[PDB]
Amino acid sequence: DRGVSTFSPEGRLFQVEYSLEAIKLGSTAIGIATKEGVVLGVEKRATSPLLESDSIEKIVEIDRHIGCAMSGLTADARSMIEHARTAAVTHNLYYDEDINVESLTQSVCDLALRFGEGASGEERLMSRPFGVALLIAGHDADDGYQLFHAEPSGTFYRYNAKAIGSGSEGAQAELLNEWHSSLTLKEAELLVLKILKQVMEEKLDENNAQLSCITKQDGFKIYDNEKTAELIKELKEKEAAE
């Protein structure tokens, strides 16, 4: 056949490029970083009405100051979150402090290219790359509120606002116009809901959509269905005005 870590004539890794196609099939995940906090939102996408939407866990806590959102093969993210939770706690044990968001993202991204049938370098025991993209968001005293996009390629970019999933290309173009450096936390909350509504196949409500924020004061908190429903109602009224 062909090696898993094989380069294409163009200069790209086959398996990594094919992994990005799997993320395109995944549910939409949007993050917006402001000076008041970083807001993360995902699409639940229930395959059946009998499926309990609250069990869908696409927003996870890494540490009190770091949150995460996933898109694509969500099962592949579980060991990545496990490593992230370990790296955050292990740093706290070694240095009696909080891990930097950039340092935490770097630790997760080091696992990405560790795949092959026996690549000469270390002991990279994995048959294939991760089929999931992560939106790592948090806060530290050094660089403040941050939003990162962790790729299966091992590369990570710091975004002011990033959208990943099925409607990622349409969402990113919308985030390009809407984002400004003076956005408030509440303005970012209605914005995540606005763009999600535009890219979701189903009508947006408190069941098929979930919000989360990370602040310096309260830390990472997942929005309950009662709190989110009021924000959907507020977003519906403001769009009805003009």
């Binding site: 380069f7 004539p9 163009e10 200069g11 890794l13 026996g118 370098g121 970019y157 984002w179």
Partner: protein, 233 residues
């Protein structure tokens, strides 16, 4: 022809070429441009950072290895992280065991041997990044060009990445000028900024776009970003 011998790095072609190595070299040409140049006192790295979106940050291109050594990347960033981390360890081993600052030439030999082992065994892939190593040791200023093939070459000036031929043609023509810039760091930076601008096509170099690093006689390896490179724009 090409389809049968490019399956893995272990396979030779009838002409004697290694296509997997050649495809890894192609990843550099797709990567962003970076320029390296030196004189007798200082060595300078000038790099053009690339962003995905206008909402994204510009990905760093220059990595510090030691107080006297550093390098700029072109291609896959994680592969540059692995090779720089190894070079950090080799510089560290020399300082701890021998109380000796590692020679830039010997550092090039170490990167050569590590890249070679990835090209002779099954299952492995070549590194998808080109590196420009600068350093000041007991023999003066140095500049070395690392290639995934293993080939490392000591140069006065060089450039790798997209449209890098324009910068390389400039440095070849300006060869006699920037070599004599001794005891003046700022003028050597300006020679590198003018070199990297010869490769520009899409946009002009801006504040959060340009990345410059320098190491010299009485100057430790320091990276300048953002406001620190505004005077060279």
């Amino acid at each position: 022809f090409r389809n049968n011998y490019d399956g893995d790095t272990v396979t030779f072609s009838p002409t004697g070429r290694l296509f997997q190595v050649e495809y890894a070299l192609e990843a550099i040409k797709q990567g962003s441009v970076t320029v390296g140049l030196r004189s007798n006192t200082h060595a300078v790295l000038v790099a053009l950072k690339r962003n995905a979106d206008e909402l994204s940050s510009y990905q760093k291109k220059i990595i510090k290895c030691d107080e006297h050594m550093g390098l700029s990347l072109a291609g896959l960033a994680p592969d540059a992280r692995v090779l720089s981390n190894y070079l950090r360890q080799q510089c560290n081993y020399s300082s701890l065991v021998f109380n000796r600052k590692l020679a830039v030439e010997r550092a090039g030999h170490l990167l050569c041997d590590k890249a070679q082992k990835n090209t002779q065994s099954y299952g492995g892939r070549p590194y998808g990044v080109g590196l420009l190593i600068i350093g000041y040791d007991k023999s003066g200023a140095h500049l070395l060009e690392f290639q995934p093939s293993g080939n490392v070459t000591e140069l006065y000036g060089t450039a790798i990445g997209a449209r890098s031929q324009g910068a390389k043609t400039y440095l070849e023509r300006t060869l006699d000028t920037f070599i004599k810039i001794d005891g003046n760091p700022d003028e050597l930076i300006k020679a590198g900024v003018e070199a990297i601008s010869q490769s520009l096509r899409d946009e002009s170099l801006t504040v959060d776009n340009l990345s410059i690093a320098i190491v010299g006689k009485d100057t430790p390896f320091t990276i300048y970003d953002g406001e620190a490179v505004a005077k060279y724009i």
